[PDB]
């Protein structure tokens with residue numbers, strides 16, 4: 233695998249370059265059906281870009297197609313969510329689902345059970361901002377999620393790749409002037425937030441399952457197949 | 464505070480000393496029931512919860528929190544803590560889960576959750592997880608799992624203190640600096656899967672409650688409602 | 693609240 | 702089968 237031969241800098245550049253674009257919602261300036269409609273439409277279009285982002289994550293192509301499918305099926309909502317909280321950082325108290333779709337917790341009440349998930353998302357974004365999370369760190373965290381979340385539901389290659397990403401995270405912190413104690417302390421803090429992201433994803437899945445059962449909004453066959461993967 | 468003053472070794476000693484006992488179940492090899500097995504685990508969990516609560520009191524920094532916060536942290540983490548304890552004592556029992564010394568089950572005897580617990584225990588085995596590392600991880604789960612749902616800042620200082628402890632242990636084990644950071648990440652990434660198992664576990668427990676074939680204790684029921692509202 | 697009581701003792 | 706299969710291949 234060529235991923236293991238990459239230096240730290242080469243690792244960072246590859247991840248930064250693989251970053252998907254920031255998509256827009258639909259242009260018209262909120263009920264449950266309308267809000268969930270926009271979010272679902274948005275998630276569906278982002279899934280297409282995520283899949284191509286994933287193929288560009290070092291080590292991911294070296295996996296079998298079946299393993300690629302499993303990792304994405306397990307992690308897709310986590311990856312959308314960490315993307316959401318990342319671009320919501322500079323907007324304290326709000327969720328920037330899209331540049332033209334910036335929501336607050338009052339909007340979360342339009343749908344039911346959404347408010348809880350909104351507050352968690354907002355908390356996580358706040359945690360990122362107060363940690364001064366950098367874009368280099370973010371892309372590392374997002375790739376860790378992709379390779380780790382489904383890894384125990386199958387492995388050695390993935391763990392080698394995961395190790396290489398750890399080395400890259402440390403490499404960035406040592407470059408930012410952090411001392412040895414600061415380096416591993418920050419590494420722990422970052423990785424522990426991944427546990428919360430997992431929690432948010434699981435609560436999110438159930439809500440999307442409730443939506444599919446309500447028949448409320450239409451969801452794409454792709455989004456449905458990703459959802460069924462957790463059933 | 465009192466936790467922010469402890470050395471790494473004093474931290475480890477405190478945690479090791481605070482460990483709960485390994486409880487027995489009410490299993491009977493002679494007696495035969497799929498629903499009865501869940502009854503066994505449910506009874507076991509209910510008795511373990513009592514010890515967990517008194518264990519949590521002894522976790523450095525935990526008692527520094529308000530009662531309302533202590534309650535929240537345990538409500539969120541109780542199944543995670545039970546599950547990581549299970550995978551730990553199941554380590555040297557390949558392909559089996561040691562719920563109790565007299566209740567050792569394999570997957571043939573829910574299926575998905577058992578498979579995940581088995582993989583987690585199997586992960587601990589090849590990593591050769593140490594007891595000192597286990598007690599650190601268990602306390603991290605307690606303090607971290609509900610921290611995002613002043614008093615919050617103190618918790619992060621304790622968490623950082625526990626990170627320093629894990630690093631100190633690994634350095635003592637002879638790992639290079641690169642190896643220390645790698646192992647640290649490896650351990651912490653496992654907590655994501657434990658979070659996941661707990662989440663899946665709660666949903667199944669909620670299924671058992673409505674089904675009503677298996678009866679839940681009054682505490683587990685309160686612990687269960689804490690994840691629905 | 694059973695959990696709260698046990699924590700209190 | 703899965704739409705995801707197709708998307709990953711191209």
Ligand SMILES: Oc1ccc(/C(=N\c2ccc(F)cc2)c2ccc(O)cc2O)cc1
Nearest residue numbers: 271272274275312313316346349436439440
């Ligand atoms: O059908 C869906 C509706 C919403 C979401 C979603 N988030 C939620 C899903 C469920 C829920 F209860 C709350 C938010 C989401 C979408 C895009 C994005 O960039 C980030 C996101 O987090 C995805 C698919």
Ligand SMILES: Oc1ccc(/C(=N\c2ccc(F)cc2)c2ccc(O)cc2O)cc1
Nearest residue numbers: 504505507508545546549576664665667668
């Ligand atoms: O009512 C309950 C039934 C099982 C469990 C449980 N595990 C499960 C919970 C839900 C599920 F769907 C499968 C296993 C468990 C109990 C004790 C222990 O030391 C470790 C454990 O993991 C706890 C309470």
